[model samples]
Each structure stands twice: as structure tokens, then as C-alpha cells.
Target: GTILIDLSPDDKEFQSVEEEMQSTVREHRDGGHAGGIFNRYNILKIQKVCNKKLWERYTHRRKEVSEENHNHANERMLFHGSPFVNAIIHKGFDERHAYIGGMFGAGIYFAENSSKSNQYVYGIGGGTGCPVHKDRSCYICHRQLLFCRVTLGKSFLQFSAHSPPGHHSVTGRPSVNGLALAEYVIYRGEQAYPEYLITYQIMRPE
Candidate 1:
């Protein structure tokens, strides 16, 4: 027999509890019988707060992806080249342009590669000051690199700007909010990065 969990959308507290319970079930599902007990407890708890409308929406959204018609002609426009990823580092910003760490544009056509077609947004991360710099000026720079990636997955893109931290690995500083900082005008279409793809990166002090 199949069991259904029902809840009303208007029930805020119940909705919160449902979300928590679902999360717990996901966490323990790998533990076999132990997991089953946890899942059972969650269902029992949610039963107390169950409503009709909430359950309806949840069921609707949880439908199999194959049954969903997300492939619309209009959605095609979302895959155009991303501008946040197309930034160009000026060689003569103030005069000099040969800095090894200066920024460079990914170029307009370069973004059309099949590998990037599925990705509409991206993230950015990096720090200031290159450990390779012997001067040790320690003049670190920290600013949001905000950009879009070709893919929704975080692993697809990585960027660094200005001073970088001691660790060259992807572990230093904090990532920036590319989607929040993106300028829509930079894209081939007026589409926003947040609606598409985004990236985040952090750098160290210089």
C-alpha cells in the first residue's frame, strides 16, 4: 500500500518541520534499518502537522524529471555567451599591461564551445598578493571577482584576481557572490546571471 503525506501551504510551522524531516530522511537513508527507523520517526512527526495544499505542491514538484517539459524554445536564449565570463584585462590600464597576473577576457567566441553550452552561469574565487612575488609587499587585495560560469556546477570554473593568498590551492579566503554582483548588460542577451550561472572566488592580502 502507498501512503501519502498531506500538508497545507499556509501552515508555516508545519512546512518548516516537513523540510527538516525530509532533510533528516535524506541524511540517514544510507544507514539501512537504522535509517528506516529514522525515516519512520520523521513520518510520524510530520503527520501531526500535515495539511492538504502543502502536500499537493510537494508532490507536484517532486515529479520525475522525464515527465517535466522543461525544454522550451524560449529557454534556448539562456545559453548565449556569458559576459561576466568575458571580462578583458586592459594591457594599458594606466600604462603597463604585461603583469603576469593581470586579467584577460575569455573572448566572445571562445565561450561558445560545446563543453560550455549547457552551463549558463558560474562562480568566482581568488585572493591578492602572489607568493611568487619576492618583494613581499604584503599589499593584499580583496574584491568580488563576480562572474558567470559555463556550467551550474561549481567545479567547472575557477578565477583569481589581484593579490593572492599564501595557499595557491582553492582553499584560501572566501568566495564572492557572482550572481549577486553580476551586471546583466555584460551578457549577449539581457538575461541575468542569477537566472543562469554564477561563480565565486577569494584571494589573500598582498
Candidate 2:
């Protein structure tokens, strides 16, 4: 029932989330366009939502993974472009429903860029959207994206599906296209927690 990160108090973000937001507030804007009605200068990119149960699960897993891994869990917030309905529809990051033979691999795949992750999202429907807005329809020109924390315990770089023998996760080759490459993959579903639900509107040229 609790969605959207806590916003009532200032500087009260979750742990490093404040650090992440240092750029988020600045970066979470439309790509600067000098003349568009919704230029980067005016339009903020999106609204955010949080799920309480999922956050607890993800954080717990981080602790467990960190204790065993020694160096750390290497947790990072990444974007996942899948059906939001499937998550609350299920329990949490459901690997069973994940698309097989992903560009990276069979495991749950995530990206650094919203554009890349959003390609998988078709349309928003039957999902709990921004609670504050009280609007549910996608027809008003909005799209949804998942921002999640993935525990990349000892991530090993690879272009193929398999993570090297000891590594717990896999990071793909580097990419220059919108910094969209480096798709991360994890075999375990518990390794990720959907931290934020991003809702944003789009403006197309006429």
C-alpha cells in the first residue's frame, strides 16, 4: 500500500538514495530542447513511487549477501522495463515471467538508462500508479518504469548469459548509446527490489 519514497520531510531519503538523488533532481528532466513546449528546462521527467514490503525484502537480502560476500553486496539502483502489474500481481521480481533469451541473458536483466529499460514497457494498465496524483489512466500521456536495487555481488563482466564461476551477477559490455549498455543480470529474483515506480509524461512535436 505504501508507494512513492517518503517525501514529507526534507533530506529524509533512504540512506544513499539522497546521494543518488543529488543527480536525480538535476538529471530527472526532459532532454533539453530549446523550443519544445516541454523542454528540459521546464518539464521534470517523472513522479516516483515506493513499495514498503518490497523495500524490506530487498534490504534484508542485501545484508545477507553482504555478510557472505565479504567485500560487499555491490548493490546498485538500475532500471527494469517490465510489466509493473506482474510484480504486485505476483510477490516480487518474478523471474518466471521474464523474457527468455534477453539481449544479455535469461536472468533478470536491468539497465542504467530509462530509455533502454522502457523499450520493454508497452502501456501502463491495471497498475497502482502515483498515489498523490490520483490519476490512473495512461491516456493522459504517461509511461511507467521500474527503478530497482540489484545486488551485484561480485559482478563479472560478460557479453554472454553465464556469469563467471564465482561471480554472483553479470555486467555486459560498455555502451555509448545513451549509456544504455552494461545490462546487468542476476539469477536470483530476491537479488532485486523495485525501489521506485517512475511515472512521466511525454511531449511529441506537432
Candidate 3:
């Protein structure tokens, strides 16, 4: 995925992911690769290894949702097309009081059947940003916020335009690009529905 962004193979970020994956594989192999130790590779492997089991689990979980059983675990409910839904999950703020934000915004608009537009942006689970700093700190804090958009229909979906905060019709307020605010929203959103919230605690360099 980073390859698409023109990140050279020599780039540290690109190499880091591969290194992380390799480390995960090593950990799995060393630790008996128990099913408990979840990793990207194992997630894929388990799907194949236990397709029937997984499908059965999916069926039971879907049935729960169908019957209005919100009691089912969030991990289990993911099978019911939950990933297709666009949402904001804010984590807590960073040490400097900066907000960590992640948003799925709209994609480009299509002329053919304007209503057919189902595109939307998906905020990466861990996108970072700064909060409105009142003390006059970081230079980036003054810039306007940006967000991704996603739109959807019965069987159609597309990404909306990447726009400044106020661009989306969802909120009348201006866009917020601060990481701290983003994370705070995600954290608060999770607090509203712990079952649906997924957060990652961030550590900033001093």
C-alpha cells in the first residue's frame, strides 16, 4: 500500500512495515503460533484454516444483529458488513493536548446519476492531528483541517472529494485537522458505544 504513495523502498516507513510483519511472523512461530496471538498474517491464515468455523460464527453473529441483538461482541459483528459503514472513532488526546483525528470523508462526484454516487473517504484508524493550541505552539496548528468522504447506495459505493472540514454536509462546523481533537472524538465516540470503538494510544516525542 505504501508503494502506491511513491515511498521509495529505501524509505524507513516502507521498510518498517515489512520489518514489523516479519517480526510478527517470528513471534508467531516462536510462540507456538497460538490462535490467541493475532497478527495480520494469522488473521488471513485463520480465515482459510477455519473457513467453516468462521462462517458459522459469522452466521450466528449476523443472526444476532438481525434479531436486534446488540449484545454480540463487536469483533463478531464485523462480519455483517460493518466495515462498509463510515464512522469517526476518536481516541484520547496526545500528551501536548493535541487531538488525534480520523475521518472517512467523501470522494469525487460523478455526473452519471448524481444519486448513484456512493464514494466516501475512510480515515485510517490511527491518523494523527493537532488540537487548537491557544498558547501559540506548532505552526501546522493554524492550517485548516482536511477530511475524507464516502457515499453509498443500495449496491453502489464511491469515494467523495477530499475537502476542507466544512465541505461535508454532515457537520456545519469547519474541518478540524488536529490529531488531538480527532483522537478525542474517537475516544468519546467509543465511550458512547464501547462495542464499536477501536482506539490506539499514541506516544509523542518530547
Candidate 4:
């Protein structure tokens, strides 16, 4: 069955994601990129996801293109942050709404760098940056971060403006297209499942 369960603070699963986010974001913070400076966030909530329909859809494309290149480890868990994330939680990913057009195409974008994804979060302030509030309610104060399972079948190094090459998905290197962070791009939403939602507050190095 599909699930959107909230993990308790001390659960093993909760700690797993919590530790991963911190360690991963920290590495990027010291990495050589303009996107690296986002150092810390105080995690507030984590919602586990299991969308059966989307998972089944992803499974189809998973093996379809696996035959093409034999890339067994193409799929991975990645980060995708957003200002308005409720639609993704309820419906699933839709590339059409991604107006950013990004550095590559306007496809659904995911990244391994949590700091890069965090740049896209909604803060309800002067700009897209983190809120400077001293702190208060999680009801209105914290921002969201989504940790997702993104399935990339046969992949391409994506600078292509064309389609129907059965690319299944695409990847962007750090400076290949002026992308400061490693990116995973997929035109079709079913190739990804929004697996977890993490609510966080900026704690340091703002």
C-alpha cells in the first residue's frame, strides 16, 4: 500500500535519513562551488513516502532501458526541494510546472547536493534565502526538503535540446552547463517517486 507516514524523532529510519542529510550537506558545504555555502539546518520533521502507482511506473522504465546500456546502478535516492510541495505529495512530480527551465531543460530536476536543493526552498521572506526569524512554530516557521528515489535508466550527459532518444533520464556535471551542482533530470515524472519530506530550519552559516 502507498504510505506517507511521519517518522518519529528517535526511530531507526528517521535517524538514517537525518544522518545522511547532515553528512551529505556538510561535504558540499566545503566543496568548491557557489552553492556550497549552505552549511546547516535544524531538522524538524520527516515524512516517509511509498507511492505504489508511481513505483510501479518507475519499475517499467527501470528495466526497459537497462537493456540498452546495462547500467545497473542508474537509479539513486536524491534531493528535490520546492516552495510549493503539497502537489507533489498528493499527485506526484510534474515537469510542466518547473518554470525555472533550469540550466539544462525544464525537466523534473533532482540533485545529490542537499545544499543545492535547499536553495530552491520556500522561506516566506524577502527573498528565496532562509528566514532569519529567531524561531517559533513549526506550523509556520520551518521550510521543507524532499528526499526522493529517482530512477534513471539509460542516461545521457544531457545538453541535448531534442527528445525521443529514449534517454529515460539525463545528468548534468558540475560545470558542463554552468550547473554548479550535479543534477539529475527526467522529462517524465513517473521515473521518480517523492519518497520523503524533510522539514527543516536554518541553524547556522546563513
Candidate 5:
């Protein structure tokens, strides 16, 4: 047998509930509205939108490292659970140079100039206490260097060199001509960050 039942609310109750639902919807919308009432949910939604836009801009600005454009040694080096690692990518000073390290758990280091006697210090780290090298020509040691700097919100990843180069260990040495170095840094956020990875090929003087 088929039977029909009416569970609908009366006109007054229905109107009351409808009005409340509409008010809630307006609250949600207004929460995200700029210069409107502030609410936690609304604020978070706005932040999410803003963060997404920022990441998009970062991706757009990043130039891809490749053999055709960068150098013949276009390889990726990745660090695992360990915080840092460093090594020479090529045989001579004019070849590819590589380094990775951090202060908290691990760190990376590099020579600041062409002087072997020079206590190479200029470098960057993932945390405080990483070593930095110095040179008479700050421009030659830091500015002309091709390196990547990364920042997430207020916390900047300590990936830039400072002073006191010889304070840390040096696994490899650079040549008089100086090696072509490629540096990169990344800060983890809501997005899944890639582990420290470096890739390259045989470094030959161009």
C-alpha cells in the first residue's frame, strides 16, 4: 500500500527557519567580505585565498634549471631525512660547485672567494649558527654569486652567506677560476615541500 504524509512546517515556522538560514548564509559571505565583520572562519578563508595567490606568484617567478639554459651539469641533488650535505659537483674550480647544510640539524657551506688561504665563510643555513664567509669585495663574494633565497611569511630561510667562512668544515676546495655554483632553498608550509634535491652532469668549461 502507498501512503503520503505531510511533514512540512506551518507557514509561520517555515518563514522563520528560512529567514534564519538566509541570515547564516549572509554571515558566511560577509565574514569573507573585506571591511566587513570579522570572524575566525572568514579570516581563515581569506588567508587561504591569499596564500594560494602568493604561491602562484612564486611558481611563476621561479626559473627552471636545465642543461640547455643553465649549464651542461643540470642535475638535481636531494637530501633525505638528514638536514644537510655538501660536495663538489665537478673536478676543477671552473666546474659546477654544490653545498647544502643547516644550523638546526644540518647546513651547507661554500668558499667566498678565489684565495685558498682565505677563510671562506660566506654562506647560508636553514637555522641559526651556520657559518658565513667574508671577502674584501662583498660584491664579488655575494652579489655576483648565483644563489636562491627563500622566505615564508615572516621567517626567512637562512640561505644567504654572511661572515666567518672557515668556522665550518670544508669537504672540497674551489679552484682559482672559481666554480659555477647553483643554490636553492625551500620553506615548508601547507604545501608538500620537496626534500633537498640536486641534479647535474659532468661539469666542463664552456
Candidate 6:
């Protein structure tokens, strides 16, 4: 079953949470290295409090992925390329601040790839710090779909359905409410990295 989590851009509680996040970003600006300031624990905590059910749903799905794929380890890496997630980070930390990592763009065009019908690739654009990396992580709840890419000598994971919906690893269910939690990860290498839990609620435009 699908559960709808309502979040308004004008909610006071949400406003407070956003302010706290802004404080964290400010700390990072004053110092250096936003990683230490905006870490997994604090970010996850804020996300959960803002939307408990959504957070729980994401965690449950993440757990299932780990249990099903015993050999693969699920890690929480910084999501640097999702437009959905980027909006949340921008709102929370102030749009002027570069609190959120990754380049901002409408979309990108790649002509060399045959899979693409045209030179323009829909729903993809920009990179974190490198030009070669274009973010492609999906964040939806209860679909039980995961997308993986091996790039820069690291594995990146995201929750997304196949192009034809049921053709992929999805649970064969319909997603409603025009809302979902988008996620993305950036891994430096195969080495064990610090675990972090982070999520964001994004509403699809009508």
C-alpha cells in the first residue's frame, strides 16, 4: 500500500528544521569540509522527524535490498546529483549558499550513445566535481527497484523503475500521490566508507 506524506513549504516545524540545517551549513562555511558538519546521522534524524512514515518506508526498502543481495553491502553516500534532493537541500540551507554539491542544469545532450534516440538525454544533466559523472539516481518509495552504476571506480545505487515499469525489478505496483523520496550516492572506491542515512520528500509537478 502507498502512504501519502504531506509536507508544506510554509510549515513552521519544517521551517525550524530547515533553519537548523542552515546552521550546519553555516558552520561548514565558517570552517571547511561540509562532510563533518552535514553528516549522515544528523541529516537522517532531521529527515525522519520531518516525515517519519516516508523515512521508515525508505529504510525498510533499503533493508530489503541488503537482505536480498547478501554479497552486496548497502552504503549511504552523499547524493550530489538529484534535482529532487537538491531542491530540499537548497531550501534548507538557503539557495545562495553552495550547501548542496553538484552542478545545476536543466538537462544534457549526448550524441554518441546509440540507446538515446536523439542527441538530448532526458532527465539527466551536470556533475559533482568531475565532468564525466552525470547523476542518475532515482528516489521512489515501495517500488523496490534499484539502479546501479559503476563509475570512477565506485558503485552508485538508486531506486528507480525500468523504462517499461514492470520490466525491471519493481514490485509491480502503481505509485500515487505524486510524491516520492529521491536518493543518489557517490562512492570513492571499494573501501569501506562511513555509513549515512539521508532522505528527502519531493512532490511531482502537476
Backbone clash pairs in model 4 (N, Cα, C under 3 Å; residues 3+ apart or in different chains), count = 0
Model 4 residue pairs with clashes: none
Q: Write the per-residue lDDT of candidate 6 for residues 153-195, one digit (tens) a residue.
A: 1222223311122111211111341332222222111211112
Q: Candidate 5 at residue 44, lDDT?
A: 8
lDDT of 1 by residue, 73-170 (tens): 11111222222332221110111111222132211212211112112222111122223432112223111111122111111123323112221111
lDDT of each: 0.22, 0.57, 0.21, 0.67, 0.22, 0.24
- In model 3, which range of ten residues has the least summed lDDT? 113-122
**RMSD of every prediction:** 20.5, 7.3, 18.8, 5.1, 26.2, 17.8
Residues 1-206, candidate 2: write the lDDT tens digits: 55444433243443244234223322212342211122111122332456567667778877887886995999888877665534532378766745566655677888775545544555222234334443332224455556777899988776434556887788887543343346788877778877655555434423
lDDT of 3 at 166: 23
Each prediction's total of clashing residue pairs, residues at least 3 apart in sequence or on different chains, is 39, 3, 46, 0, 24, 1
For candidate 5, give the lDDT.
0.22
- Could you tell me which 10 consecutive residues in candidate 2 have the lowest summed lDDT? 33-42
Give per-model TM-scores: 0.17, 0.64, 0.16, 0.75, 0.16, 0.24
Candidate 3 per-residue lDDT over residues 1-206, each given as its tens digit? 00012334466644543343223221222232111122222111100111233234434534443344234322211110012222211221112221223232232221111101111111122113223432111222222111111111111221222223322112112244221110112111111111111111111123
Please identify which of the two predictions, 3 or 4, would achieve the higher TM-score against the true structure: 4
Best by TM-score: 4
Candidate 2, position 30, lDDT: 32
Least well predicted 10-residue stretch by lDDT in candidate 6: 110-119
Cα distance off (Å), candidate 1, residue 182: 19
